[PDB]
Amino acid sequence: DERDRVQKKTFTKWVNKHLIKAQRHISDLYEDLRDGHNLISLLEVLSGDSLPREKGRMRFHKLQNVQIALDYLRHRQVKLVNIRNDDIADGNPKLTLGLIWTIILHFQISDIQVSGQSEDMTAKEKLLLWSQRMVEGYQGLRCDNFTSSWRDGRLFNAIIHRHKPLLIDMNKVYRQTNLENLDQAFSVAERDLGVTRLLDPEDVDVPQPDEKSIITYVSSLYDAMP
Numbered sequence: 663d664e665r666d667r668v669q670k671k672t673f674t675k676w677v678n679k680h681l682i683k684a685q686r687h688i689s690d691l692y693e694d695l696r697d698g699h700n701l702i703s704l705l706e707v708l709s710g711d712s713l714p715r716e717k718g719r720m721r722f723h724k725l726q727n728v729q730i731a732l733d734y735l736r737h738r739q740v741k742l743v744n745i746r747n748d749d750i751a752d753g754n755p756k757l758t759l760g761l762i763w764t765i766i767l768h769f770q771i772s773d774i775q776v777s778g779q780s781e782d783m784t785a786k787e788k789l790l791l792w793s794q795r796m797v798e799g800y801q802g803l804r805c806d807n808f809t810s811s812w813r814d815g816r817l818f819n820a821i822i823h824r825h826k827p828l829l830i831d832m833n834k835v836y837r838q839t840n841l842e843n844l845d846q847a848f849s850v851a852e853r854d855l856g857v858t859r860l861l862d863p864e865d866v867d868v869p870q871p872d873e874k875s876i877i878t879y880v881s882s883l884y885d886a887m888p
Contacts, residue, residue, distance in 0.1 A: 665872040666759070668865040672875040673762045679858045680707045691762075692753045698727025701750075701761075705734055708769045724751050740768050763874055771881045789877065792884060796821045800832075808876045813867060815843030818883075822850055825887050829854055840867045857886050 674691045677700075681687060684703045688694045695701055702713050713734060716726040728747040736742060742764060749757040767785070776788045778795065790805065797803040797820045805811045812818065816835055823830035829850050835843055844863035851857040860879045865871070 665870070665875075666755070668868075668872045669759060669875050670755075671862070671865065672860050672872070672878055673759060673766075675858070675860050676766060676878055677704060677762065679860075680704060683707050692755050692758060695758060695761075696728075696751050696753050697724045698729075698731055698750075701731040702727060704765070705731055708765070721751060735764070735768070738768070740764060766878055766881075770885065771877070774884070786877065789881060789884060793817065793821070793880065796824050799824075808873045808880065809870055812876050812880075813871055814840045815845075815847055815863075815866070818847035818851075819843055821883060821887075822847060822855070826854070851883065855883075855886055857882055 670691050674688055677688055677691070681700065681704060684707050686700055686703050688700060699715065702715060705711070706713055711734075714730055716723045716730070718724075725747045728750045732742060732745065732747060732750075743757075743760055745757050745761055745764075750761060771785045771789070774785055774788045774792075776792045776795070778791060779788060783791070786808070790808065793805045797805060797817060800820050803816060803820050805817055819830050819835045820832070823832055830847075835846075838846075841863045844861075844866055848859050848861065848863070852859055860882065861875060865875065
């Protein structure tokens with residue numbers, strides 16, 4: 663299924679947003695994590711820690727590098743779903759996506775605290791609550807999920823407007839198309855808020871936008887807004 667296509671593109675861009683600070687770069691997500699070197703570098707950039715590396719070109723050496731990465735994560739109470747080193751060394755599409763998601767969850771999404779919070783809300787729920795609160799003042803805007811609610815680009819625009827009203831023309835948003843609104847919000851957010859583009863407008867303007875892809879981008883909106 664091709665929500666996986668969008669998810670792969672989103673995860674590839676998220677990884678690269680950080681890997682570039684280590685002069686590294688991923689083209690094919692399903693190939694370029696297999697020898698463990700980019701994962702280790704990613705974990706170092708994200709955490710600041712120094713990790714070991716195994717030198718070599720054999721699979722024997724590759725499995726060892728991947729285990730460096732997974733153990734680093736496991737040792738930090740990060741639960742890894744049926745993911746063994748050789749799934750990654752073999753470029754298993756589903757498990758590779760699942761590993762990156764786990765990393766995005768741990769370093770970016772997990773520590774959130776929102777006003778109005780309930781006692782045992784997951785990270786997902788708190789982020790949803792935060793989005794609802796940001797647009798509570800706006801007539802004709804509502805947020806019920808991390809899929810359908812975000813398709814036409816108006817939540818993305820309102821959220822920016824709520825924090826920096828000078829940046830966004832809300833009346834113009836209500837005349838514009840989905841693609842023009844999406845494109846404007848992502849551009850304003852990048853140029854003025856320092857938020858890297860993880861999503862392309864045509865990845866969002868679909869019957870059902872990928873939930874993990876939207877959460878990743880909305881998460882980085884929350885993280886970057888003062």
